[PDB]
Symmetry: D2
Subunit: 115 residues, 4 copies
Amino acid sequence: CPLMVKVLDAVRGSPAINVAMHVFRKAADDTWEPFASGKTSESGELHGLTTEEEFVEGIYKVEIDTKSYWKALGISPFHEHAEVVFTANDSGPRRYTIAALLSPYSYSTTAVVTN
Amino acid sequence: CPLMVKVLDAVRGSPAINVAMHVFRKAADDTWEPFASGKTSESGELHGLTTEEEFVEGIYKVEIDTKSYWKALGISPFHEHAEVVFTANDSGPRRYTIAALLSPYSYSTTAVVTN
Amino acid sequence: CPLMVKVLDAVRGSPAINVAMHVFRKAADDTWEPFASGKTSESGELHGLTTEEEFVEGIYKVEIDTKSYWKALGISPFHEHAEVVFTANDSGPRRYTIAALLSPYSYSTTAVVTN
Amino acid sequence: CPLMVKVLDAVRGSPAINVAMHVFRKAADDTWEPFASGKTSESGELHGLTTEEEFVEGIYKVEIDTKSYWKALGISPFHEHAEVVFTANDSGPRRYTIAALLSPYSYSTTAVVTN
Ligand SMILES: Oc1ccc(/C=C/c2cc(O)cc(O)c2)cc1
Ligand SMILES: Oc1ccc(/C=C/c2cc(O)cc(O)c2)cc1
Ligand code: NA
Ligand code: NA
């Protein structure tokens, strides 16, 4: 799995299920080009975003719609979204897991990068 | 001072000093308009970005140049920047403190919103 | 798996491998009684700490030896250990995943609790 | 003020006010001796715990009563407390700021250590 995103809910102590996100890749004109998207599963995970051949060097942005997630729970959150912007594959293919831990006024994110 | 940003370094146990950041505000055409910028002080704080009169309702993005910070310490970090996107002042004027805690492959961010 | 611990390294962007930890359970005299222990695998995970029948209501403490982990990497960390203290199984059995994200001067921890 | 603790609430986007905490110091017999205690102010800060003369080399534990804080808001949280265990002043006197960011099922903590 070249790119996987895992989302956790720090308020309820659960996977964050049905969280929508889009992935973009920076174009030569510095605009954000659509690249991938999906919703987290019942495990809070989004697999199958891309393939090794398609996922080449670039700057990528994962934009996670945390606002809709909290609004569905009756909570007015701080952020419009959680976004994770990173260069990928600059030294050739790697596997990336992006994790995001969500609270109404805070988020934490980390990456696990494996060869 | 209706908007303050504080940045901390989780590797060295220190304020993150001389960290650059840019603040944008979403324009009516959905583009990001430059709003303010600056660098953190020896306390890791950036004060004086805006004024009560200038800091109107809107969607704001704070883009913290974490990459240059880590590269100056000899570390190749994961993220291009740490970004915080939020709606401000939609129920009237508030004071915002945005805090960010930085590691090479991770960041955590929270907001303190006061009336 | 009634109790699993997952440990991540925010400096290197990797699972935290070979991280030792002990689990204790609070006794009636408020002392900490040994309960379980182990080291994280190459995935940063420690499975098989306990069984459903043995893991009953109590206050549990997971004490993760983060100091030895950082010292092995030539880093002088802040904490002696990362500890996670929680009541478990007070409403009958649950499955617990405890995650810890480690930096030299900081740690973040969350729990996923499932029925 | 060689030791200060600041506590933030990630659910409400506010300082965590009136949060109790106890500080212990490890005695020669490996027991935890009471060292200081207090409650956070309206800014989420607890100042004046100790003095330069009293704050000697040692292993210290800060135990933050996060459980009572969440219970007072109607939330049944995961942790009994958030705790921070660290060696202080072993290379000479330092000033320590311990920060903790709280959610019902998660906490993040960092230290700022200055000379
Ligand atoms: O601040 C943070 C604290 C904890 C975590 C947990 C991340 C994580 C990543 C995985 O691949 C599996 C998992 O069970 C958890 C992320 C951020
Ligand atoms: O994960 C975390 C993210 C952010 C913070 C903030 C800490 C902090 C410490 C201060 O002295 C002042 C402040 O405004 C914030 C702590 C942990
Ligand atoms: Na390269
Ligand atoms: Na019960």
